[PDB]
Amino acid sequence: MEELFKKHKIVAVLRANSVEEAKKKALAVFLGGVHLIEITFTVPDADTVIKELSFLKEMGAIIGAGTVTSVEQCRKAVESGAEFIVSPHLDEEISQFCKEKGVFYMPGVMTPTELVKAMKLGHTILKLFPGEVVGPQFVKAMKGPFPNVKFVPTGGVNLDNVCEWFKAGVLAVGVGSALVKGTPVEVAEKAKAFVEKIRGC
Amino acid sequence: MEELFKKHKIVAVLRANSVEEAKKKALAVFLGGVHLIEITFTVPDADTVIKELSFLKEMGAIIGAGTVTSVEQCRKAVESGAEFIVSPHLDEEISQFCKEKGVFYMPGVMTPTELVKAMKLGHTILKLFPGEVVGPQFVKAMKGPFPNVKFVPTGGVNLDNVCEWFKAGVLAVGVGSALVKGTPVEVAEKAKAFVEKIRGC
């Protein structure tokens, strides 16, 4: 919550077509050292997944919602104990709800107009969605006008350019394809590799 | 109309400085196998071109307007028999008019905020304008959050990356520079080459 991102520096975008696979991959990413977990609403019955994955919170894993394009999804997420509200949106009706309920909300911005709209809405952290399209040059160029804004470029991140994002000055990263593809053992091994690589640079 | 795009898979962006050249290039692209035709309003007297090019509709060619940045252009297009309303806009006043009149309207979106605004407005198909700037990675990255959205990346498409767009999962493509540059014989030959290349992959 503007402090755990600087420590863990990793957010997991788990996208599964089944509930059991989603749980087995959340366990896999956690055992790899990925403490922060984000549950995409594209997973069938994401609210059920979040509610029944509450056992992982005690061991030091922070789980939250993802891709919240409606206020009903936001309410189902907050009522399920989710500690993040992540959307590709810049919804004014969801940010206000999150501020009223005191839950963390990071919006997805791709243009300076969206950036300044979110800044005026009260948010400092932002989601750089997409990440590969804008590239590492976006954060470097935007550091000037708004040095206080911290970016989490989820999407299009792998072992090749994971260190470039942190060199450019991003607070944390979000991996959804490289981290959450393959068998649970492979997923855990790749999460451990990502954590070690980020700790190296 | 959400069905012919899956079949023809090609939309022609005809940009001519004269009416006669526009007609001669529309005939050229049709004879190359390009059934779907889109008339840009930048052409002088585009409404006249659309009205007088009605003979091509009988032989199996679907013609429509392009670059409709005003509601007066939309009304002139629909009154001229145009079956498409294509804009780089995300105009709320034009989408509502098209829904009221029951004509197809595909908006141009470049950011996730525009994408979700168009989705909430009622549109599933979208125009990826520009295409070369975003690149083939945009559709691949965006397939996750919104799998139902189908993209038509008009702009910056040639024989080199025409198959990459379809591999990434785009419904159709829009070519305006490679297809509609040169003599009418060359234009027809390039349209045939594009059709054959797309049929190959």
Added chain:
Amino acid sequence: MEELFKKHKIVAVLRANSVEEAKKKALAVFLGGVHLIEITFTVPDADTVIKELSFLKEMGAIIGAGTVTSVEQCRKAVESGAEFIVSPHLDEEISQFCKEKGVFYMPGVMTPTELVKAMKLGHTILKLFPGEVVGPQFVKAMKGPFPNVKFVPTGGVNLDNVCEWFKAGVLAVGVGSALVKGTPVEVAEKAKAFVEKIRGC
């Protein structure tokens, strides 16, 4: 003011952490041939810098504000004699104020929706912020639908791609990193090199 850009073809983005360094770098860029100067509000006491740098106006140097994300910054800039109001914004409340006070205002746009919104607001010149992310292909692709729009791609410009922007058809360029980094002698030498390179192509 839609005429001096075609002549000077260079705008200097001066970003300094101190007032004296800002003045010493504005003098350096001017002596390099950079007549147009833009003062970023990120510099501490930018209004004081603009007010006390009025001696440079007599010798043929046009100075203006930059990164104006509020109307109070706009009023402080216009009251300080600044001849430009430059923002990464597309603020409707700042454009109207500039039109009322008759001062030049160039907004920053990155998407076609922002482009058409600014065009409908009454602006023809635009700031292509960021520049390196969009690349030289953006202006070439966008020349079609809106040939009347003139672009000033500030950001991500160096000696390697300075001629490519002008070949693509941009009215002027804005350099803030290559031009305004180093000692004042080095800054003046690099400004002279930029001016000579642009005059060459």
Added chain:
Amino acid sequence: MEELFKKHKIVAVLRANSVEEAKKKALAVFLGGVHLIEITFTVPDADTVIKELSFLKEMGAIIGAGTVTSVEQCRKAVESGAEFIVSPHLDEEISQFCKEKGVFYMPGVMTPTELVKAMKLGHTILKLFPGEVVGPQFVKAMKGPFPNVKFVPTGGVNLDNVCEWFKAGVLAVGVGSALVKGTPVEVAEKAKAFVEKIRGC
């Protein structure tokens, strides 16, 4: 003023045929590290140049008159804010005026008789005009009889013999040809080179 010479160790003899060129070369020499500036009255409207170049005083540049062969030029210089009165003269009517008004006055002496006349007039600092004709041997030979006299040999100084003057024991140097010839960028570069060379030895 008998203290800043020991620190800056450089005086700039700016000789320009136009006011704007004089200002552009004063800025160039300042940006090269030449804090002390001397304006020759041979420049057309030298009083106007001195009066309108008052903005440079705030940033740490000390400007003064030069070649003051009349008391009217002295009064125009002091009324214009000039902090030096430099003449090839040994005028008794100008030294008395400078003493009465409390402004610094360094006379130009070439012979021991002129040296002792100036010493009896009350001046310790002296201008060794010309410098190349007398050579570095003059100061070395004259150090004996009058060790308290400090010399500023303006004229005939370049990078070849700049260190020889300081080795011989001169307080400061005055460069008018090597420093103030060429483009403003070249002038600033040569001023920086002179400053670095003097700091080296």
